[PDB]
Structure formats: structure tokens, C-alpha cells
Design a protein around this ligand. Structure first.
Ligand SMILES: *CC(=O)[C@H](Cc1ccc(OC(C)(C)C)cc1)NC(=O)[C@H](Cc1ccccc1)NC(=O)OCc1ccccc1
Length: 221
């Protein structure tokens, strides 16, 4: 099913690549990424959202600030809290601070979230139909830290111990690559100097490589 290629960046759904710095907040960038996309779907307005808001404020939902967290917990915080502040209003500091949420600066909401079935087919359908999707991958590899170009494939990757929250913004195939030629287009949060301007093409339809389909979800708006 679905189109053979999808890239939500071409439609105005995606903010530029951000940089989490020396703070374990990948989950918060994945979540703001998915929420940015869904708010844009809903309203036609793209507004960068505050990861710091999530880092400082979503402890009650289970998140652990710069020590780690879950995208679904972030989506839950937005729902419980009744809002989330803009990036511009509540800027990213890459450390933990007092929660400074101000509803006057809220620019987004959600009514909960949807967990996608653990299959690449379902992830494809979600990406094609919904917009950018929050996912977690096994990025615990020198090959990933030093990734620069090409479709990422790591023979020692696992689908069971994912450690890194990122955002799938589309998928395609490389006229070049063909044998195992499909990729997921993944927005990372490590700045533009990493990978391909901050993005990585992850191997697609190679039996759920790196667990990309195992922890996929999106916020309901
Ligand atoms: C991606 C992150 O910043 C954090 C912490 C982290 C930093 C660096 C690494 O190493 C490299 C190699 C990836 C650079 C690893 C981790 N990771 C998370 O917050 C992680 C993301 C995730 C993983 C699976 C599914 C969804 C999100 N979440 C996490 O570790 O959660 C642990 C946890 C469990 C229960 C309650 C709170 C937190």
C-alpha cells in the first residue's frame, strides 16, 4: 500500500534539525517533532515546540529529564497539562531546571497518543497517512555515531534494546541502491553537522532493522 516515496519536509511539516547537546533528551525532540507535524496537519501552522518544557515538567508522567524518557510520556504530559509552550517562549538549555510552563505561551495540545503495531508495514502506513512518526532505534553503535552518508545498515543492530528517540519524516528507495534499497528518512537531534545535514537514511524492509518499527507512536490532536 501507500506511495513509493514520502517526504513530509516537502509539505511544511518539519522544523529544522535541532541539537540536544549534552542532555539525554532525545525523547523530548522526538516528541516535539511528532507534535509539530500533527499541529501543522491540524492548523496549517508550523511552530517549533519547547523540548525544555518537556524536560523540566514531565516528571509526573514518568520522564527523567536529561537522564532519559519516553515519547508517549511526553504526549501524556501535553494532554494532562493542557498545553505545551513554544520553543521561542521556553528555549532549550540542555540541563534540568525548574518547570516554567506558562499556559499563556501554549501553542500546542493533544488528546493522547496512538501506539503503532510493531511491524514496518504498519509504520509505512502511519507515515504515509498521518505525518511524521516518533520512533526509537538501537543507535548504540560507533557506526551510527560516525554516520555520514548512505543507507545505514549495522549488522550488529538489535530490535529489542532501542535507546534513541528520533522522528521518521518519510521513506523512499535509492535509484542507486536496489537489492536492499529502501530507507526510512529519519530526523535526528544531534545538530546539522551529524549525518546528512542531521538526517539519516535507515534501512527499510530489512526485518525491522534497529527496531525502528518497535516503539513507534504519534500524538492525537
Ligand atoms: C536519546 C537520549 O538522549 C536518551 C539518553 C541516551 C543518551 C545517549 C545514548 O547513547 C547514544 C549512543 C544513543 C548517543 C543513549 C541514551 N535516551 C532515551 O531517553 C530513551 C529513548 C527511547 C528509547 C526507547 C523507546 C522510547 C524512547 N529512553 C530511555 O532510555 O528511557 C529510559 C526510561 C525507562 C523508564 C522510565 C523513564 C526512562
Amino acid at each position: 500500500e501507500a506511495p513509493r516515496s514520502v517526504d513530509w519536509r516537502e509539505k511544511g511539516y518539519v522544523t529544522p534539525v535541532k541539537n540536544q547537546g549534552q542532555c539525554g533528551s532525545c525523547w523530548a525532540f522526538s516528541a516535539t517533532g511528532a507534535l509539530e507535524g500533527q499541529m501543522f496537519r491540524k492548523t496549517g501552522r508550523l511552530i517549533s515546540l519547547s523540548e525544555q518544557n518537556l524536560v523540566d515538567c514531565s516528571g509526573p508522567q514518568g520522564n527523567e529529564g536529561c537522564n532519559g524518557g519516553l515519547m508517549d510520556y511526553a504526549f501524556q504530559y501535553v494532554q494532562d497539562n493542557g498545553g505545551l509552550d513554544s520553543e521561542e517562549s521556553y528555549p532549550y538549555e540542555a540541563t534540568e531546571e525548574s518547570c516554567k510552563y506558562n499556559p499563556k505561551y501554549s501553542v500546542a495540545n493533544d488528546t493522547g497518543f496512538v501506539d503503532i503495531p510493531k511491524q514496518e508495514k504498519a509504520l509505512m502506513k502511519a507515515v504515509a497517512t498521518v505525518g511524521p512518526i516518533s520512533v526509537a532505534i538501537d543507535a548504540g553503535h560507533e557506526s551510527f555515531l560516525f554516520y555520514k552518508e548512505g543507507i545505514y545498515f549495522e549488522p550488529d543492530c538489535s530490535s529489542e534494546d532501542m535507546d534513541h528517540g528520533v522522528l521518521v519524516v518519510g521513506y523512499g528507495f535509492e535509484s542507486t541502491e536496489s537489492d536492499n534499497n529502501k530507507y526510512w528518512l529519519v530526523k535526528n537531534s544531534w545538530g546539522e553537522e551529524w549525518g546528512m545535514g542531521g538526517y539519516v537514511k535507515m534501512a527499510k524492509d530489512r526485518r525491522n532493522h534497529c527496531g525502528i518499527a518497535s516503539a513507534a507512536s504519534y500524538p492525537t490532536v
